[PDB]
Design a protein around this ligand. Structure first.
Ligand code: SA1
Lengths: 205, 229, 230, 235, 234, 191, 230, 225, 230
């Protein structure tokens, strides 16, 4: 049918009280067939930046490696970690350089601002049309489901526990309505001090 | 076919073309740079060809981006080419990353371009040394970029005409605790030391990065205000 | 999308809705469709959000490099020519239906640039899906040498018309008023005032929300690990 | 034409590229750079070329990071060093993109030496007048220290030196270098060798300490000015 | 001067003349044409007995019918014979026939003088090798001589290498148009032995015949070389 | 649509592939070795057009040998897997290799990677390319136990291949199974 | 004297382009060719000092067609002369391809002087040791390009050996007052007066572009003026 | 001498010394003679035999059906020019379907040689061509020079000992226009004989209706008398 | 690109650049490649600071599982030769599926050196290479010596680098027509020791057995063979 639908993906990011939460389904599916339940769609890009690539597994790995190439080169040439906004623009540049042969992945950058520690969500389409939702950034084949659940469920100023609570529950609700998405979830709660990587249980069907 | 390198190591390991470009810098007009606590300054004795020259049309102190600024000593046209390249690199950095190219990134790009021209064939090294000021995370920064493409980082330095005397003057009359106004005064005094006759605000261009971390060229009124004191 | 720029006596008023849709779903409710090009030029764009954002950033970089090297204020017809040439060389594949709105020595100028590279100087322009709902207001309320406030209200009402009548448009009306800092001085500095959320339609806001959020999904955590942020 | 060509990619009557020999001489005129391998890491040290009361020692000049597992000290033209460091960083990240693995140190050294050799064999361009002490770690060969030349020749060294008084530093290392040393022991050895060969102001020196730990992995840290001063004051 | 493609005030390409000198520094080789076949006799210079003689083969079979012997730089001759082999197989592919001896000779000669310097990206210097191209075309053996200048001449008898001039002088009164292939082999080996500085032996010589009866360019084995050296008057 | 099935064990990998090569409706050969031994440690089962699979296998094997010879170190299984992934990612966008692979390698640890023509790389305990996955994944899910012995592994792979034979309409006339362990890639028969 | 005479792009410390000066010497060595603008047309006359009596009578042209309206007298290095003739033909053809009309001698001279200048402006080229006099009645133009690339329109141009005396003699006549048919005897007399005795056999290769030729280049017919002399 | 560096360098006298060296390289070739009658054109030349038992190197070449060239100088450069001329004839017989004029071939070869002499890194062709053609332009003879120029002749001699042939041609110049094919060939062979230091002389003869043909050795015996 | 024809002929007929590349080779470490009926052995002497550097940088390389390769000369030109040879072995496998013939790969390396002698702007490889190995298509071990000139010759036992003439004399004296594998090892080791005053700590010996890969001799077996030879 569609190339994006080939690898079912469901990436969510939510903004809390000086904390972000990026969750993702753990399924590597090939159209309607589940190949794996240990597929990593969220990648740590920086100490306070995580990138979830919701889309074609091929382009998830290609974009992740290309942005690890760009971020590593930037941090070597600048002796400084990349900012969440700098990395957002980097991802936008990476996707628009292939604008006319686009990567079939929508990135979701969940980061904390380097100094203020404020949440920073930045979700783009296949070609880097980045949005900067102060509440939640969704991507993948569960896009409509995630939008619907997070619009009602997300509330401002969620602490890391509450932020994890909706990230997990809201992602579970999204994946359980997407056939090609689910098979376990992983939620990275990024805070000022620690990153909490909680593997949550979703439906395995 | 001129693709051979005209900058080559001499019998003793001395790039004669690099030394020649450095001499061109040494006869290219004195420009001073002073790093204060809360900013940095780059001034230059931009004495025009004649009183008929319009200063604004060939300002030696120029903007690379909102946060980075550059002065030079040497071949004016080489500086203009490097300045266009640095501004283009900064706007490319903004396109790819949404922020002005960092000060040390601008310095490294200028250094890379100059080294490239010292290695590729059919070209001579750029006969300019660039004093690039801008803010890094730990504070203001002044950077010398030589024709070789080697870039020093300085608290203060002059690298133009009579730059040895001016660098001794800076060694003798520089202190870290200087403010941006103190740094501008130090740069103007250094220019006075290495300039024959009375110095005038018309004849020097000053560009400063301050607490705002934005590079701004001082208008002739501000330069005169500094000179009078 | 509803973008509309008109030229009033003292300058240009550009306006845009803040709704980016990922198909039939409203992806963004605060989308920025007014793109700063130069201090005197702003482009409000419709079509593909990535294409609009990137082309506006690229032309803003080109004109910033121009103003730096040459010391010259970017011209609205210059920006429009660059945009039209770039969109023509991509044969309309960069779906950026742009409305350039600026003030140069020729005065306040509003240009349309179609995704295929067809530009046109027009007093008032509306582009996007709600471009028709907007242009109606623009057709009925624009007149030669109107003051800043009337043009602001007209462009905001045209963006609001697109918002309400068009499904692809919605949320807030962001304005950007390019104007000379001293209107009586034609040589005065061209400044811009961006009115983010100039209109926030109250009938278009979330009017209900469960105060006790009802949820019967329980999270079972397979594995937890905590890692330092440095 | 070619009247003013220097024959950079041409042999001499002795059989050595005179541009590579002049580049080596230029390195010998540059600030001393010393590398010392210890148990699970390599310590690189170097003398800054720009050392004045006014020079602001903001960032490393002779020391550069190539990747999380590779660092390089350089003797010679700092500009050519920056160019080849950019090339090495791009190559290491290219290898990481291709294999999802950190580039083996010997392969990055072979890449920079292929670049430097290509400048000595093709194109009639000036050779890269730089000698790299490429310290790094890879699973294959543990922690390694390689000495590159403008000719494009490299060799693994337990400890070595380049630059001015490189022979004196090599002799001092030979007399003093031990195997399976600790990070502190190797760093003190580098301090001793620099102090004897090289004045001696801490801010004039640069230090980087590659260290492989089974837990953290290969970690490269270029010692800051405060760290270099604290380390040197201990001698 | 100082550039490869420069003409002396005498009207000579200096690099071409120097490549001719390089050929004069190469191992001797005598090509004797007779109606039965063309016979190459080549001095194989063996710096040691450890040198595998078959690997310093100065004779190369360009095709079944045409072969070549080099004099001068063995590597430049390798390039020339590689080009000739590609040309012969291309000709068989394009025209379903063996390439003419003159045709392949002319092709390699055209390749020979295509050296250049000073222009952006070709060989940079003339081939320092002279070839004695010989083979059977239309039931006739043809012997050609190519030198670094790119000129080729059909030859009834020719010599290339260090002894080229002395070999030609010896061939003056020793070569006749009606010799048998037996006599052609004898004359080639005699001339070579005379113009070399070592006693002729089957191991330090390479003999090859473009034979009309077989219509093929074969390279003689050690047994055939012994069969020829035995008959020689010395 | 050729049936390649991989099964990763605690210290081994059983990689099986359809041994029947075909031209149109004709089964040209019944013992075609579709599993490519890129290295002595890595066997790459490939499902796709015989020509595409052969060319990709030869390219990857040549590159692995070239890496082993250029640098005196052999590629890991993760490094080789990501090199294959990079090759496929390059190909898909420009000149695609239409081959879905299972890379089984032992470099001191067993590894099985699910790779496809697009370039999706995933380490898997078991998997398959072709339509056989629709038939074998469940059996693996039903019968795979962590710490599976090599004999139990052969039994499970035999069960999966028997399911391919019995339920897949285009039943491969036979399979070639290879054990990738500390001893290398050894072809085996599952009976 | 000094080493500034080997590289065409090298400037002498006096600003002299020595290679260009040597190209001009090559022009001055050649037998003079001249052109005169007349009422009915333009007459180009080239003195051909036949080195050998075996040279074809009327062959070895020095006047060349460039266009159905443009002729080209050539002086100096004959290889460079015909190289510039063919480059002028190519420039006219490219001009027609780009613009449809036929080129004019002023801008044809500018375009060919571009190549003349590139010869001594970029390295890897030899300055053209030829002066080319482009004549066109339909453009009423007589533009001579020099080896440097300096091109000027002339009322009466002349280059080659004894070019100064030939120009001094051309100065004695108001050529536009007379037609080409009465200009031919005058120019022939000029060249015969300046013709050197050492060259026994020679010819006067006259061409004209006139109304009698309908503006087309044409060698002056033998009946009108027998070009061949002894 | 010091300016004899490149074909791109002008000597202070306006002379390209490398071009003059190539011209001398032509003057060192074997005696070549060309003649032109109102109906036929002839090129003849004593082919060079480097060795006693080597054949005489071919000197006359057939460029097109009614065009041929006799090379004098580096025979390899002559073969390269023959390849170029045959390509030009094949692209004029492709674009227009008729045979090119030998004047146009002379123009093209002169242009190529001049481009060799005008750009650094290239050498002038060390060969001079006596090209005879016949067509709508009539019989025409052109002596193309390394410098990049061709001189049209009714008769001409180049190479070594060519002064005697030139003298003979000058003596019989006015006879050539009316000379028949056989008489023009006889004049060619008797201009070469004055250069004798036949089986060496090769002669290509063309006519307005007669296609260019090469006669060598005994075939020319009938034209000696 | 740059094309300065580094390698040109001299008046005496010598390529001086090839002489200089041979000088570079002759300043390289000695290599000794010897063969038996079934096994080839290469012994390279190593100059190093044993207390301060790793002796793991080997002159002996493996172009393929059947092609062993050693070099004398510039280590960077040799690295380029070895890299190209490995690429060519793998490309021959790609194009033929058969292991590249030892003669084929030796010819390829010699042709690389030759192309550097022929390509403008390319410096001849200052490396002489010993390409050894086994061909199943011939059932013969081969040892070719490719020179900087680009000439390759097979040898029964060949040496390159410094002291190459002394080691050649040793090989000629102590060579047996039908040596056993251990006899080939002894010949190579003794030939290298004839110029080296150090044992296993200096020498580096590798070998390739019939239908086998390259195995580097241990520091225990090498020393035992050294003592046995003495
Ligand atoms: C507007 O045209 C629209 C927006 O996404 C818009 C795109 C350009 C500027 C950023 C936001 N483009 C679209 O694809 C949808 C369809 C309806 O109009 C959109 C909302």
């Amino acid at each position: 049918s569609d190339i994006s639908t080939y690898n079912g993906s469901c990436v969510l990011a939510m903004a809390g009280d000086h904390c972000v939460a990026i969750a993702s389904d753990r399924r590597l599916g090939v159209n309607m067939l589940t190949v794996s339940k240990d597929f990593k769609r969220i990648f740590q890009i920086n100490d306070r930046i995580y990138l979830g690539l919701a889309g074609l597994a091929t382009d998830v790995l290609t974009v992740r490696e290309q942005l690890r190439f760009d971020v590593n080169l930037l941090e070597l040439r600048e002796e400084r970690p990349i900012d969440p906004k700098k990395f957002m623009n980097l991802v936008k540049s990476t996707l628009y350089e292939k604008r006319f042969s686009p990567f079939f992945v929508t990135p979701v950058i969940a980061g904390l601002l380097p100094e203020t520690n404020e949440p920073y969500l930045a979700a783009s389409d296949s070609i880097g049309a980045f949005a900067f939702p102060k509440d939640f950034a969704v991507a993948g084949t569960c896009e409509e489901s995630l939008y619907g659940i997070c619009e009602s469920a997300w509330r401002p100023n969620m602490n890391p526990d509450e932020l994890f609570e909706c990230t997990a529950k809201c992602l579970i609700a999204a994946v359980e309505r997407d056939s090609i998405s689910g098979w376990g979830g992983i939620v990275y709660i990024i805070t000022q001090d620690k990153v909490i990587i909680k593997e949550i249980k979703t439906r395995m069907d | 076919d001129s693709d051979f390198s005209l900058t080559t190591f001499s019998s003793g390991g001395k790039l004669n073309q690099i030394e020649s470009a450095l001499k061109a810098v040494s006869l290219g007009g004195q420009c001073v740079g002073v790093k204060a606590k809360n900013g940095a300054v780059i001034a230059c004795e931009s004495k025009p060809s004649s009183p008929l020259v319009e200063k604004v049309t060939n300002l030696k102190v120029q903007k690379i981006n909102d946060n980075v600024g550059i002065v030079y000593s040497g071949v004016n046209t080489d500086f203009h080419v490097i300045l266009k390249s640095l501004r283009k690199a900064s706007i490319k950095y903004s396109l790819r990353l949404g922020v002005e190219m960092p000060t040390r990134e601008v310095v490294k790009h200028a250094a890379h371009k100059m080294q490239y021209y010292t290695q590729i064939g059919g070209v001579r090294p750029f006969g300019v040394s660039l004093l690039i000021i801008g803010w890094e995370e730990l504070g203001p920064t002044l950077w010398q970029v030589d024709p070789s493409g080697t870039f020093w980082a300085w608290k203060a330095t002059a690298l133009g005409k009579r730059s040895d005397g001016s660098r001794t003057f800076l060694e003798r009359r520089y202190s870290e605790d200087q403010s941006v106004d103190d740094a501008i005064h130090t740069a103007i005094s250094t220019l006075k030391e290495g300039f024959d006759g009375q110095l005038t605000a018309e004849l020097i261009e000053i560009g400063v990065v301050d607490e705002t971390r934005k590079f701004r060229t001082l208008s002739t009124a501000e330069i005169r205000d500094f000179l009078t004191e | 999308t509803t973008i509309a720029a008109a030229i009033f006596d003292g300058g240009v008023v550009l306006g845009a809705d803040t709704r980016a849709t990922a198909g039939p779903i409203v992806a963004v409710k605060d989308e920025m469709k007014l793109h700063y090009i130069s201090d005197n030029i702003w482009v409000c764009g419709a079509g593909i959000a990535a294409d609009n954002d990137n082309i506006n950033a690229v032309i803003s970089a080109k004109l910033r490099l121009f103003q730096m090297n040459t010391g010259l204020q970017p011209r609205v017809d210059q920006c429009t020519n660059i945009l039209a040439s770039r969109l023509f060389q991509y044969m309309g594949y960069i779906q950026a239906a742009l409305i350039v709105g600026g003030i140069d020595f020729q005065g306040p100028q509003v240009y349309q640039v179609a995704p295929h590279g067809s530009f046109s100087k027009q007093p008032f322009i509306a582009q996007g899906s709600g471009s028709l709902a907007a242009i109606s207001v623009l057709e009925n309320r624009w007149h030669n040498k109107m003051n800043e406030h009337d043009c602001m209200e007209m462009v905001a009402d045209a963006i609001y018309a697109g918002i309400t009548n068009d499904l692809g448009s919605g949320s807030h009306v962001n304005l950007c008023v390019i104007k000379r800092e001293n209107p009586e001085d034609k040589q005065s500095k061209v400044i811009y005032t961006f009115y983010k959320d100039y209109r926030v339609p109250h009938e278009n806001d979330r009017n209900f929300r469960l105060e006790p959020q009802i949820n019967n999904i329980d999270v079972e955590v397979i594995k937890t690990t905590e890692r330092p942020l440095t | 034409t070619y009247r003013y060509d220097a024959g950079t990619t041409t042999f001499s009557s002795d059989g050595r590229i005179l541009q590579v020999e002049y580049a080596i001489q230029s390195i010998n005129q540059a600030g001393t750079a010393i590398g010392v391998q210890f148990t699970n890491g390599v310590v690189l040290a170097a003398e800054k070329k720009n050392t004045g009361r006014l020079v602001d020692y903001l960032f490393p000049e002779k020391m550069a990071k190539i990747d999380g597992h590779i660092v390089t000290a350089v003797a010679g033209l700092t500009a050519d060093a920056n160019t080849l460091v950019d090339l090495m960083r791009t190559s290491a990240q290219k290898y990481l993109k291709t294999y999802d693995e950190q580039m083996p140190v010997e392969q990055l050294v072979r890449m920079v030496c292929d670049e430097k050799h290509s400048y000595t064999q093709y194109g009639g361009l000036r050779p890269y007048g730089v000698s790299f002490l490429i310290a790094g770690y890879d699973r294959h060969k543990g922690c390694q220290l390689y000495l590159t030349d403008p000719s494009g020749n490299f060799g693994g060294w337990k400890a070595t030196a380049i630059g001015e008084n490189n022979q004196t530093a090599q002799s001092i290392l030979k007399s003093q270098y031990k195997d399976n040393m600790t990070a502190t022991e190797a760093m003190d050895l580098t301090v001793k060798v620099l102090c004897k060969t090289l004045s001696l102001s801490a801010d004039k020196l640069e230090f980087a300490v590659l260290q492989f730990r089974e837990e953290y992995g290969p970690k490269v840290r270029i010692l800051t000015t405060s760290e270099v001063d604290t380390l040197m004051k201990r001698y | 001067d100082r550039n490869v493609n420069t003409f002396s005030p005498d009207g000579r390409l200096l690099q071409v003349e120097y490549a001719i000198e390089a050929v004069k520094l190469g191992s001797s080789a005598v090509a004797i044409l007779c109606p039965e076949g063309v016979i190459f006799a080549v001095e194989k210079r063996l710096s040691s007995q450890l040198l595998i003689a078959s690997s310093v083969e100065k004779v190369y079979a360009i095709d079944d019918h045409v072969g070549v012997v080099m004099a001068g730089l063995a590597a430049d001759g390798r390039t020339m014979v590689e080009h000739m082999r590609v040309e012969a197989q291309n000709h068989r592919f394009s025209f379903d026939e063996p390439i003419g001896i003159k045709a392949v000779t002319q092709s390699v000669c055209d390749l020979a003088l295509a050296f250049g310097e000073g222009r952006r990206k070709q060989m940079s210097r003339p081939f320092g090798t002279a070839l004695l191209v010989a083979g059977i075309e239309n039931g006739k053996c043809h012997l050609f001589h190519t030198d670094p200048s790119g000129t080729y001449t059909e030859c009834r008898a020719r010599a290339i290498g260090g002894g080229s001039e002395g070999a030609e002088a010896l061939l003056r009164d020793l070569y006749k148009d009606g010799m048998t292939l037996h006599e052609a082999e004898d004359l080639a080996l005699s001339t070579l032995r005379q113009v070399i500085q070592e006693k002729l032996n089957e191991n330090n010589v390479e003999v090859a015949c473009a034979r009309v009866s077989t219509g093929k360019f074969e390279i003689y084995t050690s047994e055939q070389r012994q069969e020829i050296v035995a008959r020689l008057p010395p | 649509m050729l049936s390649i099935v991989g099964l990763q064990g605690p210290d081994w990998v059983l990689i099986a592939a359809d041994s029947s090569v075909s031209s149109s409706i004709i089964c040209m050969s019944e013992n075609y070795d579709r599993i490519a031994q890129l290295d002595d440690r890595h066997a790459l089962a490939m499902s796709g057009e015989t020509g595409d699979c052969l060319q990709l296998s030869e390219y990857l094997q040549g590159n692995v040998a070239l890496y082993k010879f250029r640098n005196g170190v052999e590629l890991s299984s993760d490094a080789l897997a990501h090199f294959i992934r990079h090759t496929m990612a390059k190909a898909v966008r420009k000149s695609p290799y239409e081959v879905n692979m299972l890379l089984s390698g032992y470099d001191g640890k067993p590894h099985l990677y699910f790779m496809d023509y697009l370039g999706t790389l995933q380490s898997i305990p078991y998997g398959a390319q072709g339509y056989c996955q629709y038939f074998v994944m469940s059996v693996f899910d039903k019968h795979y136990k962590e710490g599976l012995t090599l004999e139990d592994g052969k039994e499970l792979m035999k069960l999966a291949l028997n399911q391919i034979k019995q339920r897949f309409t285009v039943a491969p006339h036979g399979f070639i199974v290879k054990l990738v362990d500390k001893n290398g890639i050894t072809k085996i028969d599952l009976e | 004297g000094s080493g500034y005479d080997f590289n065409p792009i090298t400037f002498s410390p006096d600003g002299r382009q020595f290679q260009v000066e040597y190209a001009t010497k090559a022009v001055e060595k050649d037998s003079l060719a001249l052109g005169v603008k007349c009422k009915d047309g333009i007459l180009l006359a080239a003195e051909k000092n036949l080195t050998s009596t075996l040279l074809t009578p009327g062959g070895n042209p020095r006047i060349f067609w460039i266009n159905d309206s443009i002729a080209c007298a050539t002086i100096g290095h004959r290889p460079d002369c015909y190289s510039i003739v063919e480059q002028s033909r190519n420039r006219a053809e490219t001009f027609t391809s780009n613009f449809g009309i036929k080129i004019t001698v002023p801008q044809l001279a500018s375009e060919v002087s571009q190549q003349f200048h590139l010869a001594h402006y970029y390295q890897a080229y030899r300055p053209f040791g030829c002066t080319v006099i482009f004549a066109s009645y339909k453009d009423d133009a007589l533009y001579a390009i020099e080896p440097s690339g300096a091109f000027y329109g002339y009322f009466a141009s002349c280059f080659g050996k004894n070019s100064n005396l030939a120009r001094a003699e051309l100065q004695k006549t108001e050529w536009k007052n007379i037609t080409v048919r009465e200009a031919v005897p005058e120019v022939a007399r000029i060249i015969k007066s300046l013709h050197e005795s050492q060259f026994k056999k020679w010819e006067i290769e006259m061409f004209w572009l006139c109304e009698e030729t309908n503006g087309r280049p044409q060698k002056v017919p033998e009946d009108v003026f027998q070009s061949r002399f002894v | 001498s010091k300016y004899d560096e490149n074909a791109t360098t002008f000597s202070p006298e306006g002379r390209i010394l490398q071009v003059e060296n190539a011209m001398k390289a032509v003057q060192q070739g074997m005696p070549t003679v060309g003649l032109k009658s109102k109906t036929h054109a002839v090129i003849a030349g004593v082919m060079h035999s480097p060795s006693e038992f080597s054949s005489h190197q071919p000197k006359i070449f057939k460029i097109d059906q009614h065009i041929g060239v006799a090379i004098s100088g580096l025979t390899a450069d002559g073969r390269g020019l023959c390849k170029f001329l045959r390509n030009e004839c094949l692209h004029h017989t492709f674009c227009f379907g008729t045979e090119i004029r030998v004047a146009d071939l002379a123009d093209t070869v002169a242009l190529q040689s001049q481009k060799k002499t005008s750009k650094v890194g290239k050498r002038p062709y060390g060969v001079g061509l006596l090209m005879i053609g016949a067509g709508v332009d009539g019989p025409r003879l052109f002596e193309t020079c390394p410098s990049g120029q061709h001189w049209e002749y009714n008769a001409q001699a180049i190479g070594r000992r060519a002064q005697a042939a030139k003298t003979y041609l000058e003596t019989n110049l006015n006879e050539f226009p009316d000379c028949t094919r056989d008489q023009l060939i006889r004049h060619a062979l008797r201009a070469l004989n004055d250069c004798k230091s036949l089986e060496a002389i090769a002669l290509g003869v063309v006519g307005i209706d007669e296609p260019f043909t090469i006669l060598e050795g005994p075939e020319l015996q009938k034209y000696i008398d | 690109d740059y094309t300065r024809s580094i390698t040109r002929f001299s008046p005496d007929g010598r390529l001086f650049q090839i002489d200089h590349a041979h000088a570079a080779v002759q300043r390289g470490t000695t290599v000794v490649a010897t063969r038996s009926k079934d096994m080839i052995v290469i012994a390279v002497e190593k100059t190093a600071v044993a207390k301060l550097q790793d002796p793991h940088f080997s002159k002996i390389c493996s172009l393929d599982k059947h092609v062993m390769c050693a070099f004398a000369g510039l280590h960077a030109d040799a690295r380029r030769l070895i890299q190209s040879g490995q690429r060519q072995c793998q490309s021959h496998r790609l194009t033929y599926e058969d292991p590249i013939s030892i003669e084929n790969i030796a010819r390829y390396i010699a042709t690389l050196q030759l192309k550097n002698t022929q390509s403008g702007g390319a410096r001849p490889y200052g490396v002489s290479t010993l390409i050894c190995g086994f061909d199943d298509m011939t059932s013969q071990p081969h040892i070719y010596e490719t020179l900087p000139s680009g000439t390759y010759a097979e040898w029964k036992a060949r040496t390159i680098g410094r002291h190459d003439q002394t080691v050649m004399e040793y090989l000629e004296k102590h060579y047996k027509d039908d040596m056993t594998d251990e006899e080939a090892q002894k010949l190579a080791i003794g030939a290298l020791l004839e110029v080296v005053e150090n044992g296993s700590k200096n020498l580096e010996v590798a070998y390739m057995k019939r239908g086998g890969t390259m195995e580097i001799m241990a520091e225990e077996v090498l020393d035992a063979l050294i003592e046995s030879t003495k």
